[PDB]
Amino acid sequence: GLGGYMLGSAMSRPLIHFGNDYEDRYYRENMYRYPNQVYYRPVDQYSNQNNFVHDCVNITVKQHTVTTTTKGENFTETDIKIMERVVEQMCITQYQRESQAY
């Protein structure tokens, strides 16, 4: 499950750009439904950024949808689409943080 995973501190949601003013307007009006912090394993447990990141995205996303759908939610193809993109940026930033403090 979440064995050995740490909850990172909250951060600003990354402003990810989409050309169509619709998806943008959608991410903006829906980011409150997405995470603003992530789950990660100590960085000394990965060989590179891509491994830390891939692992971080799957865990953060999963935990988020199971705990939020419990209270009442619905994540479409678009919601998942957007979430993985945003969480990935946050995971890469969480990576920078971890390696910087080492």
Partner: protein, 219 residues
Amino acid sequence: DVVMSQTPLTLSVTIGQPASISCKSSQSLLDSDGKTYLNWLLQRPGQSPKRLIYLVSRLDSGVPDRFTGSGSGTDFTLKISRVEAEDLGIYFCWQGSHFPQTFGGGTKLEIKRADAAPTVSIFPPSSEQLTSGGASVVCFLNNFYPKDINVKWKIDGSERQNGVLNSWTDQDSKDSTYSMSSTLTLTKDEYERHNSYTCEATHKTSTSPIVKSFNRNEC
């Protein structure tokens, strides 16, 4: 423990008309994560609940714009701008914002339809039951409307209440009517001590009772 107060208990509406349902929680439903987890579900007769709206106003796929959810803090409203056949059933809110989650009492939504006199059928005890020393006289009063109805049993002309058990179905999805089942059970000894058995229904569609009866003497 947040208490969800849903009103009204029942609603009777004409197709095409609007319907409003209310859910007020004892405490604010704004969750710590900034969201407001207020859900609206629909439980059709015989079916298990199905969610129509989540997060106060978001529609689940398939749900018509006819349905809208609004409110915030403690006042929430489920609205149907134009009600219709398929909508009949029990509605209720469910809040997931605080531990423990709580449900509203529910609002039974009745869809009005033209009046229908009950179809009445009376059944003498089955042979196989008269061998066990018991006797049951079953009477069905099916597909009527409005729901208000009253059944009365008479043995040789005397009203009989002892031993009567009734059961009513919810509003039907197909023809939106109601049905009733009334069963009079007595001992075979007694059953054989009387002749005519009558089932009388008092319903708006008739000023005089809608009777159905038989004579034990198979006459």
